[PDB]
Amino acid sequence: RTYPNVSHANTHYKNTVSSKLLPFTANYQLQLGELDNLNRATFSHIQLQDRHETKDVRTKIWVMNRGHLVGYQFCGLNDEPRNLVAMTAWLNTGAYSGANDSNPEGMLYYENRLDSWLALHPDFWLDYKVTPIYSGNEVVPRQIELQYVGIDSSGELLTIRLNSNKESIDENGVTTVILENSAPNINLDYLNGTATP
């Protein structure tokens, strides 16, 4: 249900002040960037309410594994390459094995708290964009950028605080968090998409 110190503030900016967001149509939208010339995903961008989530109790069943850009319970996508990148387990769920939504180095910390915010504010919208950052020809992104802001019924931006020291707010109240695609005990080959201790 809830996490400590997850909140928002109304900025009183109309969403149209930002060029970073999806247009506010008051309909669910999911926009996926093209696969680029190296077949890499480029972004995944959603705008949703709590009612639109795909809350599945169960989901579908070395060389690095691929993790979602926008997490599953927001977008409901299975195996869509434009929403997948090679990702460490550390980045994906915040632990080498299993899941740790306390760990602010992992995506799950942020997405679970955004989900809690959505559930507490069923009439408001989350605009949330996840962008992998690549260097050169590398097929594994070095970093993933999470960008989020809330939108109320009247289209005004709500700055959402998830209580992490990584949240950077721009001059319209839109928050960006940059996470590293690495893990404590592992070296990655960013070029070929493999890992070793």
Automatic annotation (TrEMBL):
<dbReference type="InterPro" id="IPR001604">
    <property type="entry name" value="Endo_G_ENPP1-like_dom"/>
</dbReference>
<keyword id="KW-0732">Signal</keyword>
<dbReference type="InterPro" id="IPR044927">
    <property type="entry name" value="Endonuclea_NS_2"/>
</dbReference>
<feature type="domain" description="DNA/RNA non-specific endonuclease/pyrophosphatase/phosphodiesterase">
    <location>
        <begin position="24"/>
        <end position="197"/>
    </location>
</feature>
<protein>
    <submittedName>
        <fullName>DNase</fullName>
    </submittedName>
</protein>
<dbReference type="Pfam" id="PF13930">
    <property type="entry name" value="Endonuclea_NS_2"/>
</dbReference>
<dbReference type="GO" id="GO:0003676">
    <property type="term" value="F:nucleic acid binding"/>
</dbReference>
<dbReference type="InterPro" id="IPR044929">
    <property type="entry name" value="DNA/RNA_non-sp_Endonuclease_sf"/>
</dbReference>
<dbReference type="GO" id="GO:0016787">
    <property type="term" value="F:hydrolase activity"/>
</dbReference>
<dbReference type="GO" id="GO:0046872">
    <property type="term" value="F:metal ion binding"/>
</dbReference>
